[PDB]
């Protein structure tokens, strides 16, 4: 039962993560690139600093990783292999984390209330800052879920240790890349 609860949480929180990134792209980003309204000169043409590579992270989870995780729903003991297969894609969280301080400083010093207004306009519970920390939270969460699976899978569980090794290597590399 316990490994079934863990697999269910993995899948349900992955759908929530894809939804969250999709909302962030189609609200805060879409207002900047649309040309519908007014971009202060301090953030004009600087969407790439504010949002980093969160588009490419979204594309990976929406096009590939959620669909492949769903294929492991009845195979929780083997799901470590999913992270092995797709380990190279997780390198873009290193790029994302490196850029995060520059993004936060730009928003504070030069965005004013531009994004607060968009948030009130759309009725969003989450500020742009709440969305932009989610890739940092998610990439440090996978290792916790894999650790939990190891407490309740047998010893055909070498297909968890190898995936856990990947998902400890990735956030450590991102950590070591910060200034």
């Amino acid at each position: 039962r316990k490994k079934e609860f863990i697999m269910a949480e993995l899948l349900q929180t992955e759908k929530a993560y894809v939804r969250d990134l999709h909302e962030c792209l189609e609200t805060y980003l879409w207002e900047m690139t649309s040309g519908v309204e007014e971009i202060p000169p301090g953030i004009l043409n600087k969407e790439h600093i504010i949002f980093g590579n969160i588009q490419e992270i979204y594309d990976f989870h929406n096009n590939i990783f959620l669909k492949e995780l769903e294929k492991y729903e009845q195979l929780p003991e083997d799901v470590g292999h999913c992270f092995v297969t797709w380990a190279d894609k997780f390198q873009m969280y290193v790029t994302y984390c490196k850029n995060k301080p520059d993004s936060n400083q730009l928003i504070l010093e030069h965005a004013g209330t531009f994004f607060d207004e968009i948030q009130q306009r759309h009725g969003l519970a989450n500020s742009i800052s709440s969305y932009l920390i989610k890739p940092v939270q998610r990439v440090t969460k996978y290792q916790l879920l894999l650790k939990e699976l190891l407490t309740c899978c047998e010893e055909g569980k070498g297909e968890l240790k190898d995936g856990l090794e990947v998902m400890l290597s990735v956030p450590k590399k991102a950590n070591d890349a910060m200034h």
Partner: protein
Amino acid sequence: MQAIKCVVVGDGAVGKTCLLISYTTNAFPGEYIPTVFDNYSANVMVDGKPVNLGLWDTAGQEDYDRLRPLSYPQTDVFLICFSLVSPASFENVRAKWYPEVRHHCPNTPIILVGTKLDLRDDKDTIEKLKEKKLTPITYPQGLAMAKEIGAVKYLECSALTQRGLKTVFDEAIRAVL
């Protein structure tokens, strides 16, 4: 209506995720303890005034010292947590959590929170600590640590029984107002 960002920090042993789940759902999760608490906001009423309380978890970041501060800017109040039956987690308040919170947020208020209150009297817990020449953390130790780090309150609570739990978050809001 005022919005409040509250960030919860401390060792893995404190039960950060379980604490937040039990507070926001008014029930200990019991059967299975989830690992994920996504950023949360609710309207809560304190001293006859509506407040939008935002809560961020940090579980999973305990070993990444340069990733953790990415959550810290523009925080209105911090909960620095330790488990009352883990002396190692209590000492890390002084060694680990207070130093980085103060360095990044020198003017933000702190509440010191001792968790797992229900275990302080548990015979099995006490005995396993005794085998390592330790004992649970008692109220005056928490008072002395709170004074040392400049916390505006020290509070004890249990996610299991919900004793003291709502008070923790009520007082976090009052520290900002």
